[PDB]
């Protein structure tokens, strides 16, 4: 249909870099669409920042801080999306489930 997000997490954006000049902060949700991420605001209706895993340079989950380094081809551009989870479990739970989905794309992409 369209909004068939495989997994969905609820995090709280953090004012680090990209969430300061563009005003991207508050309570969002990391919806993993097995290929495209969707930062939806809990107090909204339509997706807020529909990004893609192919543009995310990398994603770190330091205990509770789950930031996502983004590079070119990013809906916002070069920068980083830091955020906070419930503790050191929701971060290690969303990083392991998101690492498998992304690994299925680059691994199931194509040889060459």
């Amino acid at each position: 249909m369209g909004p068939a997000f495989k997994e969905v997490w609820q995090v709280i954006l953090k004012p680090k870099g990209l969430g300061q000049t563009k005003n991207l902060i508050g309570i969002y949700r990391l919806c993993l669409t097995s290929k495209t991420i969707s930062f939806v605001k809990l107090n909204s209706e339509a997706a807020a920042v529909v990004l893609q895993l192919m543009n995310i340079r990398r994603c770190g989950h330091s205990e509770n801080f789950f930031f996502i380094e983004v590079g070119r081809s990013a809906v916002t551009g070069p920068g980083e999306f830091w955020m906070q989870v419930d503790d050191s479990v929701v971060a290690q739970n969303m990083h392991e489930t998101i690492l498998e989905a992304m690994r299925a794309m680059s691994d199931e992409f194509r040889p060459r």
């Binding site: 995310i56 340079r57 680059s106």
Partner: peptide, 11 residues
Amino acid sequence: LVIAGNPAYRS
């Protein structure tokens, strides 16, 4: 600083 990487990023 637990960090990870993005495999589908290509680069």
